[PDB]
Design a protein around this ligand. Structure first.
Ligand code: HEM
Ligand SMILES: Nc1cc(Cc2cnn(Cc3cccc(Oc4ccccc4)c3)c2)c2nn[nH]c2n1
Ligand SMILES: *[C@@H]1O[C@H](CO)[C@@H](O[C@@H]2O[C@H](CO)[C@@H](O)[C@H](O)[C@H]2NC(C)=O)[C@H](O)[C@H]1NC(C)=O
Ligand SMILES: *[C@@H]1O[C@H](CO)[C@@H](O)[C@H](O)[C@H]1NC(C)=O
Ligand SMILES: [Ca+2]
Ligand SMILES: [Cl-]
Ligand SMILES: [Cl-]
Lengths: 464, 103
C-alpha cells in the first residue's frame, strides 16, 4: 500500500515531509516509496542486496528484452523475415511505431482520458516514461527491421532466426560503438577516458561484468542534464507550433503525444538542436522532476533527486567519503576540506548543515556536487564509478564487437563507419542532422549537415 | 553452457563461461563496498527516528532536495557544448544496463 499510505511498514519507506516545505504544506503527508526487492527475502543472515532485472551487457537489451518469453513476444512470428513486431493500429508517416502493451494498470491512459493511448511495449519496461525515450526506442526498432530487410536481399537463403540474430548482433554493436567512441569521452572528459578506459586489448574472462549497486545511483547524474520542457521542432528546425515547449510534468507516460502529436521526427529534432541543461553547483536539477515528477499519474508529484537519495539508503550504499576512498581520492573530514574538494565553500556549508559530516553525504548528492572535469560532465568521483563500471562492461563481455571471433576484420572495418545521425537518416523523414559528435552538436544550422555527407553502413561483408 | 557460440543469449547467461550467471538478468548486484544499514543487514539509515549515522542525525531526502537541489527555473544555464541527445542517450543506455525491481 505504498502508493497511498504514509506508514513506514515493509516494503514502504515513505519520504517524510520537512517543516516549511515549498510545496507540501501537510506534514502528515509523504512522498511514496517502495523499497527495492531484496535478493534474499526475509533473511536474518544475508546483508540485504538488490536485483538487476536486466543484462549488464551493452547488448541492446532495451530493444530485445532480458527474458526469453518477452524477447519472443517482441518478435514478428507471422513470417521468416527476422523482424521485430510493430504497432498494428498506428504509423508515423507510414513508418513503424512500437507495439502497445497490455497492462493491468496502464499509466499512459491517465495522461489523457479522450486520447485512450496506452503504453508502448519494448525490451525495457520504461519505454513510455517520456516521449524522447520512446522516440529513441522507436528509432532502434526501425533500425533492426531495416537491417533484417537488407540482409534478406543479400542472403535470401537465411531464415527468420538467422536474420533476427544477425541484425540484433549489428544493433548491439552499434550501441557499443556510439557509447564508447562518442558518449563516454563526453561524460568523463579525456584524462578520465584514458585513466578508466585505456585502449581495448582483448576479452578477459576474469573481469566481473556485473553492474555494481553504486552504479545504479551514480549513473543518475544524468538527472542534472534534464531540461524542463520537451522541445518539438519542424522540418526547418523551427519551433513546431502550437506547443513547441511542453512542460515535462505533462509528457511523462504521454504515449498519445507520439501517436497524435506528430510522431518521433519533431521529438528527435528537438533533442539534436536543443542544448542539454548544464549542471552548475547552484542549479543542480529542475523543478519539473523535483516537484512535478509523475504529477498526472500519482496522488502527489514526486521529487526525483530526493528519490535517488532515499534509494541509496534503501540500497545501503556507503556515503560520499567511503566512495572517495574506494576511488583513491582525498576524503574531506570537515566543511573547509569539502570546500576545497568542491572548489566551492557556499555548497560545502549548505551540505554540512544538512549532513553534519562528508561521511554521511548521499552518493548522488556528493557526486553531482563536485566540479566537472575538463571537457567532461562529471567530477572525479562519478568519473571513477562510471569509468570503472564501463571498463568492466567492455573487458568482461565475450561478445564485445572488437573481440576476435565476434565479427570479421571487414565487418569491424564496416561497423567503425556507423554513427547515431546516420541511424536517424535511415529510419526517419529527417534529412538534415547533427554533425559528428551528435552529443556535442546542438545549434542549427551551425552544427548541422545533410544525410548524403554521412557514410551508410556497408553490409557487403555479410553476404554468405 | 556451449563450448562454441555465434550469438548472445537473451538473458546474458553463458557470456562468462566460468561463472555463467555473471552479467545475466534477474541476479543480485555486485557490491564494490560492504552495505551500510541502520541494523547492519537490512534497515535503511533514516528508518528509525533518533538513530544517527556516524554520530550524526540522518537528514530527510526532501530537506536535502529543498535546501541544495532547488533553484529558480528562469536561471537555467543551457550547455554550450552538449545537446539534449547527450541526455537522452544516457537514459537509453541506462535502460540497457540496470532496472531495479520493486514489489
Ligand atoms: C529524462 C527523464 C528521466 C526520468 C523521468 C527519469 C526517471 C527516473 C526514475 C523515476 C527513476 C527511479 C527513481 C527511484 O525510485 O529511485 C530513475 C532511475 C534511474 N535513472 Fe533516471 N530518469 C530520467 C533520465 C535519466 C538519465 C538521463 C539517466 C542517466 C544518464 C538516468 C539514469 C537512471 C538510473 C541509473 C536509474 C536507476 C535505474 C535502475 O536500476 O532501476 N535517468 N530515473
Ligand atoms: N527503475 C526506474 C523506474 C522508473 C519509473 C518507471 C517508468 N516506467 N516504469 C514501468 C511501469 C510499468 C507499469 C506501470 C508503471 O506505472 C508507474 C508510474 C509511475 C511510477 C511508478 C510506476 C510503470 C517505471 C524510471 N523512469 N526512468 N528510469 C527509471 N528507472
Ligand atoms: C488530449 O488529446 C486530445 C485529442 O484526443 C486533444 O484534443 C484536441 O484539443 C484541441 C483543443 O485543445 C482540439 O482543437 C482538437 O480538436 C482536439 N482533438 C480531438 C481529436 O478531439 C487534447 O488537447 C488533449 N488533452 C489535453 C488536455 O492536452
Ligand atoms: C509481421 O511482418 C509483416 C511483414 O511486414 C507485417 O506485415 C506484419 O504487420 C508484422 N506483424 C507485426 C506484429 O509486426
Ligand atoms: Ca543489457
Ligand atoms: Cl499493437
Ligand atoms: Cl556497490
Amino acid at each position: 500500500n505504498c502508493e497511498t499510505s504514509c506508514v513506514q511498514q515493509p516494503p514502504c519507506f515513505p519520504l517524510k515531509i520537512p517543516p516549511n516545505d515549498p510545496r507540501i504544506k501537510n506534514q502528515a503527508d509523504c512522498i511514496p516509496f517502495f523499497r527495492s526487492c531484496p535478493a534474499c527475502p526475509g533473511s536474518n543472515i544475508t546483508i540485504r542486496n538488490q536485483i538487476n532485472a536486466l543484462t549488464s551487457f551493452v547488448d541492446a537489451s532495451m530493444v530485445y528484452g532480458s527474458e526469453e518469453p518477452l524477447a519472443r513476444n517482441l518478435r514478428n512470428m507471422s513470417n521468416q523475415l527476422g523482424l521485430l513486431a510493430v504497432n498494428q493500429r498506428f504509423q508515423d508517416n507510414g513508418r513503424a511505431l512500437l507495439p502497445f502493451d497490455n497492462l493491468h494498470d496502464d499509466p499512459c491512459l491517465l495522461t489523457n482520458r479522450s486520447a485512450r493511448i496506452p503504453c508502448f511495449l519494448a525490451g525495457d519496461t520504461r519505454s513510455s516514461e517520456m516521449p524522447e525515450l520512446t522516440s529513441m526506442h522507436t528509432l532502434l526498432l526501425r533500425e533492426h527491421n531495416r537491417l533484417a530487410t537488407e540482409l534478406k536481399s543479400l542472403n535470401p537463403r537465411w531464415d527468420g532466426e538467422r536474420l533476427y540474430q544477425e541484425a540484433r548482433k549489428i544493433v548491439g554493436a552499434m550501441v557499443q560503438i556510439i557509447t564508447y567512441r562518442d558518449y563516454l569521452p563526453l561524460v568523463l572528459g579525456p584524462t578520465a577516458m584514458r585513466k578508466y578506459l585505456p585502449t581495448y586489448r582483448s576479452y578477459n574472462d576474469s573481469v566481473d561484468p556485473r553492474i555494481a549497486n553504486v552504479f545504479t545511483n551514480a549513473f543518475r547524474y544524468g538527472h542534472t542534464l534534464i531540461q524542463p520542457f520537451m522541445f518539438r521542432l519542424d522540418n526547418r528546425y523551427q519551433p513546431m507550433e502550437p506547443n513547441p515547449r511542453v512542460p515535462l510534468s505533462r509528457v511523462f507516460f504521454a504515449s498519445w503525444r507520439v501517436v497524435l502529436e506528430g510522431g518521433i521526427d519533431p521529438i528527435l529534432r528537438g533533442l539534436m538542436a536543443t542544448p542539454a541543461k548544464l549542471n552548475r553547483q547552484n542549479q543542480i536539477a529542475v523543478d519539473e522532476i523535483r516537484e512535478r515528477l509523475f504529477e498526472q499519474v500519482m496522488r502527489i508529484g514526486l521529487d526525483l533527486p530526493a528519490l535517488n537519495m532515499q534509494r541509496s539508503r534503501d540500497h545501503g550504499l556507503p556515503g560520499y567519503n567511503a566512495w572517495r576512498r574506494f576511488c583513491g581520492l582525498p576524503q574531506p573530514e570537515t566543511v573547509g576540506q569539502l570546500g576545497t574538494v568542491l572548489r566551492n565553500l557556499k555548497l560545502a556549508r549548505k551540505l554540512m548543515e544538512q549532513y553534519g559530516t562528508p561521511n554521511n553525504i548521499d552518493i548522488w548528492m556528493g557526486g553531482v556536487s563536485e566540479p566537472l572535469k575538463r571537457k567532461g560532465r562529471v567530477g572525479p568521483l562519478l568519473a571513477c564509478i562510471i569509468g570503472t563500471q564501463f571498463r568492466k562492461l567492455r573487458d568482461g563481455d565475450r561478445f564485445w564487437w572488437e573481440n576476435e571471433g565476434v565479427f570479421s576484420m571487414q565487418q569491424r572495418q564496416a561497423l567503425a563507419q556507423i554513427s547515431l545521425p546516420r541511424i536517424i537518416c535511415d529510419n526517419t523523414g529527417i534529412t538534415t542532422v547533427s554533425k559528428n559528435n551528435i552529443f556535442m552538436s546542438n545549434s542549427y544550422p551551425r552544427d548541422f549537415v545533410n544525410c548524403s555527407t554521412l557514410p551508410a553502413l556497408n553490409l557487403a561483408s555479410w553476404r554468405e | 553452457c556451449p563450448e562454441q557460440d555465434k550469438y548472445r543469449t537473451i538473458t546474458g547467461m553463458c557470456n562468462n563461461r566460468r561463472s555463467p550467471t555473471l552479467g545475466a538478468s534477474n541476479r543480485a548486484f555486485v557490491r564494490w563496498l560492504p552495505a551500510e544499514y541502520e541494523d547492519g543487514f537490512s534497515l535503511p539509515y533514516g528508518w528509525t527516528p533518533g538513530v544517527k549515522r556516524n554520530g550524526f542525525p540522518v537528514a530527510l531526502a526532501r530537506a536535502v532536495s529543498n535546501e541544495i537541489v532547488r533553484f529558480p527555473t528562469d536561471q537555467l544555464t543551457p550547455d554550450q557544448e552538449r545537446s539534449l541527445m547527450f541526455m537522452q542517450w544516457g537514459q537509453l543506455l541506462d535502460h540497457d544496463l540496470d532496472f531495479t525491481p520493486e514489489p
